[PDB]
């Protein structure tokens, strides 16, 4: 389950498609918890493509549901990111995930 809560500005029309490499300034957040990940810190804005299952399932569906210049607000369920396993030391099992996502892409 991906729930988009959009900070408006941008275009609203340029949607990501297959075979397109897109550029995202992400910033993670734990529900009732601190930060755990940020692309703003390294300033390397995480170039990745669509449809190769490189990212987790919750981040993948919210990427296509944005457009150029926009700023969404993800809410990833535990069963789509890590909630059974949990990433060791970084993500606990049965975790609900929040992401500050900006789509400033190409292609």
Describe it for me?
The protein has 107 residues and is of the alpha+beta class. The protein has 2 helices and 4 strands; from the N terminus they run E-H-E-H-E-E. The chain has helices at residues 39-42, 57-64; strands at residues 21-30, 47-49, 71-76, 97-103. Its EC number is 5.2.1.8.
Any chance you could write out the topology, listing elements then pairs?
Layout lengths: L20 E10 L8 H4 L4 E3 L7 H8 L6 E6 L20 E7 L4
Antiparallel strand pairs: 1-2, 1-4, 3-4
Protein name: Peptidyl-prolyl cis-trans isomerase FKBP1B
Organism: Homo sapiens (Human)
GO biological process, one term: negative regulation of calcium-mediated signaling
Annotated CATH architecture: Roll
Beta-strand residue fraction:
15-25%
Output the strand order for the largest sheet: 2-1-4-3
Helix content: 10-25%
Main sheet attributes: strand count, strand direction, barrel closure: 4 strands, antiparallel
Q: Regarding CATH, which class?
A: Alpha Beta
CATH topology: Chitinase A, domain 3
Helix/sheet category: alpha+beta
Distance between the termini: 26 Å
Question: SSE order in H/E notation?
Answer: EHEHEE
Indicate the overall shape.
globular
Number of spatially distinct domains: 1
Counting DSSP E segments of at least 2 residues, the number of strands comes to 4
Keywords:
1 chain of a larger assembly; 11% helix; alpha+beta; Chitinase A, domain 3; 107 residues; four-stranded antiparallel sheet
């Amino acid at each position: 389950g991906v729930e988009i809560e959009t900070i408006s500005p941008g275009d609203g029309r340029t949607f990501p498609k297959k075979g397109q490499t897109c550029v995202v300034h992400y910033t993670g957040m734990l529900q009732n918890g601190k930060k755990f990940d940020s692309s703003r810190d390294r300033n390397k804005p995480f170039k990745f493509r669509i449809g190769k299952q490189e990212v987790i399932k919750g981040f993948e569906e919210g990427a296509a549901q944005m457009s150029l210049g926009q700023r969404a607000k993800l809410t990833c369920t535990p069963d789509v990111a890590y909630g059974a396993t949990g990433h060791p030391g970084v993500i606990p099992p049965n975790a609900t995930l929040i992401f500050d996502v900006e789509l400033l892409n190409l292609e």
